[PDB]
Amino acid sequence: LENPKISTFQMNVSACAWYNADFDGDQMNLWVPWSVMSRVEAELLCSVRNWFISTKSSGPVNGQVQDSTVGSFLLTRTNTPMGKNVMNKLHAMGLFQTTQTDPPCFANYSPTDLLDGKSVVSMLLRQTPINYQRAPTWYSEVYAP
Amino acid sequence: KIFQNVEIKPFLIDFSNLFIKNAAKKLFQLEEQLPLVPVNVVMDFKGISRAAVHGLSRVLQDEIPNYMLDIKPGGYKIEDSTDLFMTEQFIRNRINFIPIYAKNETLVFALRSLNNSCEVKTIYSRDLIQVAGPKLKYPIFNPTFEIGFLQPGKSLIIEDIYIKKGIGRKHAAFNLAVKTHFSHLDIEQYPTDKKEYMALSGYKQSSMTSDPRHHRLGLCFPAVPLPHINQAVRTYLKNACRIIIGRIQSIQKIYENFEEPQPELVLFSMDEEKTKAIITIKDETHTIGNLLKTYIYEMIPDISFVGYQCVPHKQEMVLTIIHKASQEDLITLLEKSIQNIIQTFQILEKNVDELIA
Amino acid sequence: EPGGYFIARGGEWVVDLLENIRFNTLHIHYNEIIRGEFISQPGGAFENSSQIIIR
Amino acid sequence: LKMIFATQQLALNYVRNAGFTVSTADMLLTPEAHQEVQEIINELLLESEEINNRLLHGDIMPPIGLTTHDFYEKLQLNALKFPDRILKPIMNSINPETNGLFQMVATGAKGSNPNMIHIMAGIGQIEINTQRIQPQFSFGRTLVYYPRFALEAQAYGFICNSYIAGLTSPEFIFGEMNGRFDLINKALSTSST
Amino acid sequence: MLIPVVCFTCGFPIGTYAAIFDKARTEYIKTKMGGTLPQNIPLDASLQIELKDLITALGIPMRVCCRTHLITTLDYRKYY
Amino acid sequence: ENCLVAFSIIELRKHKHDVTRRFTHVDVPQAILGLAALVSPYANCTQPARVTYETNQGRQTGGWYCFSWPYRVDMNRFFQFYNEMPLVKTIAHNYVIPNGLNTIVAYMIYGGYNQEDSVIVSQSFIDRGGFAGTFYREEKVELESDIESFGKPDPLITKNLKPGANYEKLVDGFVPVGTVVKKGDIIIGKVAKIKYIDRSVMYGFDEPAVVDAVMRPHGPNDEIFGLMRLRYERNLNIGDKMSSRSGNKGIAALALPTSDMPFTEDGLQPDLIVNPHSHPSRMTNGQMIETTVGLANALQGVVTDGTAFLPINVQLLSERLAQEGLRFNGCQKMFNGQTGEYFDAAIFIGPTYHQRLQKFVLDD
Amino acid sequence: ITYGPIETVDNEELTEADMLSFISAAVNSTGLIGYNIKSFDDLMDNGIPQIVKQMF
Amino acid sequence: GEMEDKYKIFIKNAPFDPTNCQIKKDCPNCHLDYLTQICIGSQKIIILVCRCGYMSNRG
Ligand SMILES: [Mg+2]
Ligand SMILES: [Zn+2]
Ligand SMILES: [Zn+2]
C-alpha cells in the first residue's frame, strides 16, 4: 500500500475465517521470508489455499460473509420491488469491471437488452462449471405460512 | 443549448429578526449584508448523460483548483504567542477553512493580537491585517469568523499567512461547492410519503435500466462577492468545464502514440479478430473514468467490453476495452469518443457564457 | 475537577475502594467439613481485629 | 479462492446500484400486530397462572423421582415458551421484499429468528443453566422489587417487553444477569481449553 | 473549543454566523424564560427552546448536518 | 432485605388500591445504573451486554481530558479540540462533559469496506478536525551529583556516542522547544565525568514529534533533571477505533473524498458509513432510535433527553419525523458519489453521536 | 412527627421525568465523589490523633 | 420434617414481615380481607397466616 497514511494490515473479509479475526481492533503478525528455502516452502506448503478445506472438519472454511451473502441473494433474486430483476448491457458489464478475471463478451447485446441476475452470474461460473442443487437458506418452512 | 434555466440565489442574513439584528449590531456593527455571501446555483441540463453532469459536479466539489489561507513554516511565533490553549494546530485548522475569494497569490496577512485586559478576548477575522501584496479594494473573507480566544495577559502572533493553491481531493480546505440538489427530470417518481413506497428511492425506474438525459443540479458556493455574484458563478462553471477538457486532452495524447511503446497504453490482439486496449492513468478519479466509459459505450453500442477501475489503494484509473476491430480501428473509435467528450464540454461552457448574465 | 486523589513522586494515584467483608459477623462456609469464622473489632474502624474460627 | 473473490465483486457491485439499509422502522410492529403479540403473551401468563392456582390448592403431584419444586419449575418453564405463531404478527408487519432486517436474517447473512422476535415481539423467559431466576435475595426473593414467595412469572425472569419497546428495571436486571453469565463462560473459554 | 469554521460534514461556512448565533441564542432564551437565576434555569429546559427560526434568519440552509454542528458544539469559553 | 420496593412510580400507581401488594419504598428506575451507563441513550432498548461494552468503551473515549493540560507534562494523553453535546442527551451529561461529535451516519452497504465492524469515514470530515486533537508524551532524565551534566557532547573527548544519531539539534543540552525530533535524533545531551562516556537520550519512535515544552525542575533531593514534553498532531486515520454510545465499536477502514461519498437528493452526505450487519446480532436498538430522534432534533433545533427507563414510543418518534418533512422511516433517496447513480432503495442516514476510542494505530 | 393523611396527596400527574429530579437531588447532595473526601477529613480530624495516641 | 421447627419463627413472624406475599382471601378468625401466603420447602407447602394468629394446616 503505497499510500503513506495507511498503517494497517489490510485483507479480504473472507480471509478472516482462517484466523477467526474481525476488524474491531484485532492485531496480526506478519513476517516476510528472506531466505530462499523459507521462501519456497511458504509458497508451496503454507499458502492459504491449503487451508481452504478444514483439517478439523474436512469441510470448506471460506465463502461469502454478510454483504456478498445478502448481495448474492439480491443479485440472483428473481423479482425486485421494481418488477423483474434485470439490468441493461452497461450495468451488466459494470458488475465485471472489478472481478479481475477476464471480462466476458457482451457483443451479442444491444444497449437496451436486459440481462437477468442469474444470466450475469452464469457468465462467471462458466469458468469452473459445477453441478449444484439444494434449497437456499431463503426458503424456510418457518416463514412459508 | 445543452443546459438552460440557471437559478442563482444568495444566502442572506435576515435583519427582520430582532435577536439577530441586535447581536450583529453589538458584535460587529453590522446592519448590512456581509461582503461575501454563499450562493446557491441550480442548473437544468438537457440531452446529456449523467456521467457528464456528475463529472461536472464532482469537479466543482473537489477537483477544481481553489485557494485557501495557510501559515508558512515558522510563521507562528512561539515566542510572543504566550497563549497556551491556542495551539498552532488549532489555529491553523481554523484559518485553513475560512472561505476566501482571492484574485492573486501575492497577498500575505498577519495576525497580531494582544489581550491586555482582565477578560478572555475573542480574536475575529477582522483582526487579520494585510501586510504584503496590493491593497484590497474589496475583502477576500468575512470579518466575523471566530479565529480564537485569549486568556487575560496572553497574546497570539502569526506571521506569513499566505494564499495556497490546491484541490479539495487532496485537502478538504480546497473544496469549493457543497451539494444541495441532484435529480433527473425525465424519470417519474412515486409519492414516498406513503408507507407503501417509503422504502424505495422514489424513482419509477430501476437505476439498472434507466438512462436519464435531463438533470437538475444544485451546488452552493460558500463565499462570493455580493456585487459580482453572476461574475463569480459563471467563472466557476467555466473553469470546471475547462478542467475536465484538460484532463480529457491528456488521454488524447496517449491514444495517438499507440505505435510507440507506452506505459499508459497496452494493446493486445486477443484473437485474429479481437483487440484489447488497457489505459492506466495515475491519480485519476471516477470523473474521467466514467466519462470515458460512457462515451466509448455510446460510440460503440456493440462493444464486447468496456470497463474501468479506480481501486482506492492504487491511486490510478485503469480502463479496459475489448472490441472486434483492429488496433487502427479501435484507436480511431477511441479518438472519436474523446472528441465527442470535448465537444460536449465546449458546448457546456458556451452555454454558460450565454446563460449567466 | 472534584479532586480526591494523591500526588506521589510527581504522579497521580487513587486509593482503591476495597470490597472487604463485614466485621463482627459470623460467616459460615463449607476432615474439616464446615467452617464458621468471625473477625471481631472492639469498637471503631481503626482498632486491631482478632479472628476466631469455629470448625 | 479466485471464484470467492470474483463472485464477491459481482455481489458488491450489484448492491452499489441496488442499495441495502436497515432503519428503525424495520423493527416496528403495526398497532394491529402489537395487539396480537400482547394476546399471545397473556396466553403464556394465563397458562402460567393456572399452574400457580394448582399450587395454591396443592394439586401439583410430581412423578416418581421429582420433587414438587422441580416439577413446578418444569411446568412453568414450558408454559412460558413462545409459540411458533409468534411470527404471524412479526411477518404481518414487515415486507420481506424490502425489509433489510428480515433479509439479513432470512438469507443467513447475519442474525437469527430469536433475535428478530426479541427485537420486535418479546423476549420471554430468561433461562440460566436451563433454569429460571433462582431466589438469591434472602430466601424466596429474586429481587428487592418482588415479595417473598412471589408467584407471578415476572418475579423469575419473564420479560413481556421487546427491546424496541424498552425494558423496565426488573426486566433489565434479569437480562443483565443473563448477559453476565455468557461473558463469564466466554472468559472460561480461553483458560479451560 | 468553538463552533467550527465550516460544517464538519459538508463544509458550509457555518462559522461566519457562529458568533452572532451564540449571542442571539442567549438573548432568545432569556426571552423564553422570563428573568431567572442562571442556575435556576435548568440545563434540560434551555435546550428545548426551538432555534429553527433563528438559524433560518441567519441565512443557514435546512441541512441536518449544519444545524446539528451549529446547535450542539460546545464553547470552551463557557467551561473554563 | 426488609424492603418491598416498587420499581417505578408507574408501578406504584398501578397498585395504588392493591392491599395484597403493599410497598415500603418506591424507586426511580435510572438509579439502578452507574454514571457511565447513563451516557448511553435508550439503554433499556439495547441488549444489556452491549451496555456493559459501552461502560467499558465510554471511559476509553478521547476528549477534553483536563482543563489544565497546558500546565501538565503527561504520558500518552489525548486532547480533542472539538466536542459536542449529543442531540439526544441523557442525565449523565448534567455531570460530565461530553466527548464526541454528532456524526452523520449512513447505515448502508457501500463497496464492502465497512464489513465486520469497520466504518468508512469521510476524508473531508477528517481534514476539518473531526476527532482531531493532540497527543502528549513525557520524558524524565536525571543527573548524578557532580558526575553527570547536561550539555552538547563532543565526539573527540567523549566515548561511546550512540551510532548514527544526530547530535546537532542540541542547544545548551536540550533541543529547543518548537523543533521536530526525528527517529535517531538526540533529544537530551548528557556527559559523564569518569574521559567521558555518552549517556545521551535518543528518540526511538516511528512518528516525528515536536518539543512542546522543556523545563529544568528540581527533584526530591534538590537536583536538576531534564523534563521534556513531546506533542503529536493526531488526526483521525485508518486504524483508529470509533464507537457510539451503544457500544458499537469499529475500526476506520477507508476514507473517501467528498465527491466519492454518497449523497441524498438534498445533498446530505455521511461522515461515517456503518454496515447494517452490525445491528441484528448485537441488538443495539438504542443507536437506531437515537438516529431517528436526533434526525428530527436537528431540523427542529432542539436537544432532547434520551435517558434510559423513560417512557418511549418508537411509533410516535417515527411520526415525529413525518411531521418534520421527512419520511416515516427516516430514509432518503441517495445517490452513489462515484457514478452518480441513485440506489434503488432509500438509505437510513442521520446524526448519531460517535466517540474516538484511545487506541491509536500508530502506537500499536 | 404526625404526617398528613396519605389519601389526600396529589401525585397523579407525577411523570416519570418528574422522578429524575430525585436523582438530581441525590447526586447533588451526595456529590459524584462525596465519601472519598469525607473519609479523608475524618482521618485528618478524628482518625490520626486517636490512632497515634490511644494505640501505642 | 418442616413447618414445625425448621421454620416456626419465620412462620410466626410472617404476618408482620412486609416483604411477604399477600393473598386476597378472607380470614375465618378475625374476618380480615387478606392473608399472608408462604411457600416453604421443596414440597412447596402453602401456609396462609394472619396477624390474628390464624394458621392453615391446623396451626
Ligand atoms: Mg476482534
Ligand atoms: Zn453541513
Ligand atoms: Zn385473621
From TrEMBL, chain A:
Top-level lineage group: Viruses
Purpose of the protein: Catalytic component of the DNA-directed RNA polymerase (RNAP) that catalyzes the transcription in the cytoplasm of viral DNA into RNA using the four ribonucleoside triphosphates as substrates. Forms the polymerase active center together with RPB2. Part of the core element with the central large cleft, the clamp element that moves to open and close the cleft and the jaws that are thought to grab the incoming DNA template.
Subunit structure of this chain's protein: Part of the viral DNA-directed RNA polymerase that consists of 8 polII-like subunits (RPB1, RPB2, RPB3, RPB5, RPB6, RPB7, RPB9, RPB10), a capping enzyme and a termination factor.
Homology family: Belongs to the RNA polymerase beta' chain family.
Name of the protein in question: DNA-directed RNA polymerase subunit
Origin organism lineage: Viruses, Varidnaviria, Bamfordvirae, Nucleocytoviricota, Pokkesviricetes
Residues of the full protein shown: 436 to 580 of 1450
Automatic annotation (TrEMBL), chain B:
Biological process terms in GO annotation: DNA-templated transcription
GO terms for MF: protein dimerization activity
UniProt entry keywords in alphabetical sequence: DNA-directed RNA polymerase, Transcription, Virion
Major subcellular site: virion
InterPro entries (alphabetical): RBP11-like, RBP11-like_dimer, RNApol_insert_sf
Limits of the DNA-directed RNA polymerase RBP11-like dimerisation domain: 277-350
Its biological purpose: Component of the DNA-directed RNA polymerase (RNAP) that catalyzes the transcription in the cytoplasm of viral DNA into RNA using the four ribonucleoside triphosphates as substrates.
Family that this chain belongs to: In the C-terminal section; belongs to the archaeal RpoL/eukaryotic RPB11/RPC19 RNA polymerase subunit family. In the N-terminal section; belongs to the archaeal RpoD/eukaryotic RPB3 RNA polymerase subunit family.
Protein name: DNA-directed RNA polymerase RPB3-11 homolog
TrEMBL record, chain E:
Keywords: DNA-directed RNA polymerase, Host cytoplasm, Metal-binding, Transcription, Zinc
An individual GO BP term: DNA-templated transcription
GO cellular component, one term: host cell cytoplasm
Gene3D superfamilies in the record: Homeodomain-like
GO molecular function annotation: DNA binding; DNA-directed RNA polymerase activity; zinc ion binding
Cell compartment(s), UniProt: Host cytoplasm
Family per record: Belongs to the archaeal RpoN/eukaryotic RPB10 RNA polymerase subunit family.
Subunit structure: Part of the viral DNA-directed RNA polymerase that consists of 8 polII-like subunits (RPB1, RPB2, RPB3, RPB5, RPB6, RPB7, RPB9, RPB10), a capping enzyme and a termination factor.
Role played: Component of the DNA-directed RNA polymerase (RNAP) that catalyzes the transcription in the cytoplasm of viral DNA into RNA using the four ribonucleoside triphosphates as substrates.
Protein known as: DNA-directed RNA polymerase RPB10 homolog
TrEMBL record, chain F:
Domain (DNA-directed RNA polymerase subunit 2 hybrid-binding) ranges: 37-364
Homology family: Belongs to the RNA polymerase beta chain family.
Function of the molecule: Catalytic component of the DNA-directed RNA polymerase (RNAP) that catalyzes the transcription in the cytoplasm of viral DNA into RNA using the four ribonucleoside triphosphates as substrates. Forms the polymerase active center together with RPB1. Part of the core element with the central large cleft, the clamp element that moves to open and close the cleft and the jaws that are thought to grab the incoming DNA template.
Native species: African swine fever virus
Name used for this protein in its record: DNA-directed RNA polymerase subunit beta
Residue span relative to the full protein: 747 to 1118 of 1242
